[PDB]
Amino acid sequence: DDEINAQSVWSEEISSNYPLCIKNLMEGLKKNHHLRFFGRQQLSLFLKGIGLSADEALKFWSEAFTRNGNMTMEKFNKEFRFSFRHNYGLEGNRINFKPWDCHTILSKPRPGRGDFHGCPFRDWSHERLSAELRSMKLTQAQIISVLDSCQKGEYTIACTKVFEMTHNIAHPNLYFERSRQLQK
Ligand code: SF4
């Protein structure tokens, strides 16, 4: 827990290793203090996969959902705590839910307005992808290549390109582990 914990998953150091879908889910969680079912699962299970303990997860999710009076701790405990515990098996269900790979994520129903699950390389506009990638210090040429992949429907290749351009068999947790190790 000294490395991956409820507080460190909000740090720049750890979050620099997230792929765009996880970055998007964290941003929606930060802005809205809530995520709908599909994004709640995609993000909760990705964090379980990178080693966030069950105890630190309940800290992370309860703090994020109750921020700025968005809901009382009571409402969190009555309406969400069970669902988050179930993702770790804490309520006695003997299923160890596995993190979603890219194919699984792309296969979920496409996000609509207010949703943050899915794959930004498919689900975002070029304008929104361009700005996000500019903010990650990518150049014009580099962004055009990434978008070429997006236009061909080759989302996991576009993601791989972004990994390659931001560092000096398709799975968000694999992106995280590969990026974290280059960070060490
Ligand atoms: S390709 Fe996979 S890891 Fe990359 S942004 Fe899309 S769903 Fe996430």
Side-chain angles (χ1 to χ4, degrees), residues 3-22 24-77 79-92 95 97 99-109 111-112 114-136 138-139 141-150 152-163 165-167 169-183:
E3 164 170 315
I4 300 302
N5 62 62
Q7 296 174 84
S8 81
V9 297
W10 289 117
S11 73
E12 298 174 48
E13 177 190 353
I14 295 301
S15 71
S16 72
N17 302 295
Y18 298 159
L20 292 206
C21 53
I22 301 313
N24 187 44
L25 285 157
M26 292 285 279
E27 282 300 305
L29 177 65
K30 188 176 163 298
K31 250 216 179 276
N32 290 327
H33 317 314
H34 175 259
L35 292 172
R36 297 197 178 112
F37 181 65
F38 291 147
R40 153 166 61 84
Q41 294 307 96
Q42 182 171 342
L43 177 61
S44 170
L45 296 180
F46 164 88
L47 296 167
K48 176 168 161 199
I50 68 166
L52 189 66
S53 77
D55 274 18
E56 297 288 323
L58 268 297
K59 288 165 60 160
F60 173 82
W61 284 107
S62 64
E63 192 278 329
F65 272 33
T66 64
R67 229 175 252 181
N68 264 105
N70 188 77
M71 79 187 60
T72 167
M73 200 56 68
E74 170 216 35
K75 186 184 233 269
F76 180 87
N77 294 338
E79 292 184 18
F80 296 96
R81 187 170 89 100
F82 177 86
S83 300
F84 286 117
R85 289 161 63 85
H86 190 246
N87 284 346
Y88 282 78
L90 298 185
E91 295 267 339
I95 319 282
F97 295 147
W100 295 359
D101 65 2
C102 294
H103 176 66
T104 287
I105 284 160
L106 292 163
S107 289
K108 298 296 183 197
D115 293 338
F116 293 87
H117 68 277
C119 172
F121 294 107
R122 178 191 63 196
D123 298 322
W124 282 0
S125 71
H126 278 195
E127 312 84 288
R128 177 43 194 305
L129 266 178
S130 315
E132 188 75 29
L133 302 162
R134 265 170 290 201
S135 147
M136 294 174 57
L138 264 41
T139 75
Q142 290 179 321
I143 289 179
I144 286 180
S145 187
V146 170
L147 298 179
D148 201 358
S149 283
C150 294
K152 290 172 168 156
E154 303 181 302
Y155 310 118
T156 60
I157 298 287
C159 188
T160 301
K161 293 178 161 181
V162 165
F163 183 104
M165 289 156 33
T166 60
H167 291 88
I169 181 160
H171 201 303
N173 288 86
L174 186 61
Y175 191 115
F176 182 83
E177 287 305 328
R178 279 169 163 166
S179 174
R180 185 72 171 139
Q181 300 253 328
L182 301 180
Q183 204 175 41

